[PDB]
Amino acid sequence: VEIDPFEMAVKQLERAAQYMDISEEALEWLKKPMRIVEVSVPIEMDDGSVKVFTGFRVQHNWARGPTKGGIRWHPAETLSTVKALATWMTWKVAVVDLPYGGGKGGIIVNPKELSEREQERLARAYIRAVYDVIGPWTDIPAPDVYTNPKIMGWMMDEYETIMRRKGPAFGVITGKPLSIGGSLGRGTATAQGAIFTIREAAKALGIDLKGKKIAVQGYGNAGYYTAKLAKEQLGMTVVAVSDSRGGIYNPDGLDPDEVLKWKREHGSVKDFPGATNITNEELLELEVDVLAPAAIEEVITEKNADNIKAKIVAEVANGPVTPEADDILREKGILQIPDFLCNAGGVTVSYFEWVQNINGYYWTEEEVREKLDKKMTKAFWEVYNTHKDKNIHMRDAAYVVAVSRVYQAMKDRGWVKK
Numbered sequence: 067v068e069i070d071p072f073e074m075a076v077k078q079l080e081r082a083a084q085y086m087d088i089s090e091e092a093l094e095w096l097k098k099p100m101r102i103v104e105v106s107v108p109i110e111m112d113d114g115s116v117k118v119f120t121g122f123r124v125q126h127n128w129a130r131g132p133t134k135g136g137i138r139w140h141p142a143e144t145l146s147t148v149k150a151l152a153t154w155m156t157w158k159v160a161v162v163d164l165p166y167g168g169g170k171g172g173i174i175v176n177p178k179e180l181s182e183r184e185q186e187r188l189a190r191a192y193i194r195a196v197y198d199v200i201g202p203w204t205d206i207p208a209p210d211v212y213t214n215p216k217i218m219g220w221m222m223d224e225y226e227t228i229m230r231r232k233g234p235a236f237g238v239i240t241g242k243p244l245s246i247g248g249s250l251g252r253g254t255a256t257a258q259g260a261i262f263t264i265r266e267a268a269k270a271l272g273i274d275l276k277g278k279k280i281a282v283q284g285y286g287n288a289g290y291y292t293a294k295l296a297k298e299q300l301g302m303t304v305v306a307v308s309d310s311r312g313g314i315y316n317p318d319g320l321d322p323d324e325v326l327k328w329k330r331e332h333g334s335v336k337d338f339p340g341a342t343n344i345t346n347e348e349l350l351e352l353e354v355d356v357l358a359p360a361a362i363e364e365v366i367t368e369k370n371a372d373n374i375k376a377k378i379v380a381e382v383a384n385g386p387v388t389p390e391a392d393d394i395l396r397e398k399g400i401l402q403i404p405d406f407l408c409n410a411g412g413v414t415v416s417y418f419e420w421v422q423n424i425n426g427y428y429w430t431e432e433e434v435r436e437k438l439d440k441k442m443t444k445a446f447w448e449v450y451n452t453h454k455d456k457n458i459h460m461r462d463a464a465y466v467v468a469v470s471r472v473y474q475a476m477k478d479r480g481w482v483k484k
């Protein structure tokens with residue numbers, strides 16, 4: 067990473083609080099995670115040896131309600147990354163007006179080197195380690211990078227076993243399989259929210275998205291579904307995709323299903339027939355109308371900020387653009403959808419899955435789709451009008467929408483007097 071994630075997040079928070087009336091004590095409260103739990107996760111490997119991994123569960127604030135945030139499994143992960151992600155989670159749930167705080171979990175592990183049984187043991191041991199700080203009304207984990215609904219179901223089963231089925235165990239964690247208390251539309255949640263935000267941004271900019279070009283970085287649960295939905299719902303032409311090993315570009319357009327099949331039959335999208343192999347740096351610099359980074363954070367810095375040529379940058383990923391790069395892009399007249407507003411959908415659907423779990427009653431695809439569209443449109447238009455009225459950057463405006471709400475919560479709890 068170019069710069070420390072938590073330091074960057076704090077810098078963004080201060081940079082944006084420079085445009086609002088907030089007390090010093092509240093700022094100091096908001097610049098520090100409220101609880102951090104570092105645990106050792108011991109599992110038994112396939113060869114019989116015992117290996118200990120490092121797990122983090124960081125909740126940054128729970129003034130507005132129980133904290134929410136996914137679990138990231140990553141070899142390059144650090145406690146600072148989890149702290150920054152929890153801080154961003156807070157604003158993410160505040161901007162779309164959810165009764166959640168901000169939370170984040172992670173394990174420093176390379177899941178590609180672990181078998182199915184080892185992954186299940188790791189998930190169960192992580193739950194056993196962090197049971198004392200999580201719950202349906204305390205902290206609700208969710209899927210994240212290199213984690214999937216499978217691992218979510220394993221974690222839910224372990225939590226239910228520990229909890230002795232005393233309460234709504236299904237609601238302890240979101241992004242679950244549909245058989246064990248899953249929610250319809252959760253699989254394409256973040257992609258649907260990103261597509262709605264892109265449509266609203268195009269509406270605001272007066273741009274017809276039909277026939278235009280979209281370049282997506284990362285081909286995971288968010289990137290692939292974003293490309294598919296953009297090709298299907300917005301009528302866009304997916305000209306380039308990528309994963310950690312590289313990307314494929316095609317001026318005539320790519321079919322996301324064939325690319326996914328190739329990536330599932332070969333391990334990567336590289337050397338896809340009819341496409342040219344490029345790098346992620348080259349993909350970010352392509353002449354496209356929409357650029358959606360859906361991968362690791364900090365991909366746009368002063369080393370490529372001036373080389374971005376997309377009309378709209380949809381930050382599907384968590385914190386993919388640095389504040390400096392934000393200033394450069396804004397100087398270039400490029401509209402940016404803020405990271406914790408563009409991918410609010412995934413956190414909006416998860417909240418829906420939560421409500422269904424705690425109420426014991428489950429909804430349909432149409433209801434979830436309608437509610438998600440309504441929430442995302444309202445949040446995006448609030449942020450847009452906020453940035454237009456005050457003549458400030460998008461990222462900052464969302465903060466003004468988000469942090470203020472969080473601030474209000476503290477003033478309603480007595481945490482800060484001023």
Ligand SMILES: NC(=O)c1ccc[n+]([C@@H]2O[C@H](COP(=O)([O-])OP(=O)(O)OC[C@H]3O[C@@H](n4cnc5c(N)ncnc54)[C@H](OP(=O)(O)O)[C@@H]3O)[C@@H](O)[C@H]2O)c1
Pocket residue numbers: 136209210211212213256283284285286287288289308309310311333334346360361362363382383384409410412413
């Ligand atoms: N997961 C969610 O529910 C959710 C909801 C909203 C937002 N987000 C945010 O969106 C981002 C993507 O999450 P995800 O769920 O899509 O993860 P994922 O599906 O588990 O995998 C991410 C994808 O990005 C690729 N990738 C990883 N590191 C990369 C790098 N350094 N450069 C280029 N590509 C890389 C990976 O390719 P390989 O397959 O080759 O490893 C992988 O396919 C995350 O940062 C997350 O915070 C996630």
Ligand SMILES: N[C@@H](CCC(=O)O)C(=O)O
Pocket residue numbers: 134135136137158206207208209210240241409412413414416417
């Ligand atoms: N932005 C969060 C959303 C997790 C959730 O649905 O609670 C993440 O994927 O890390």
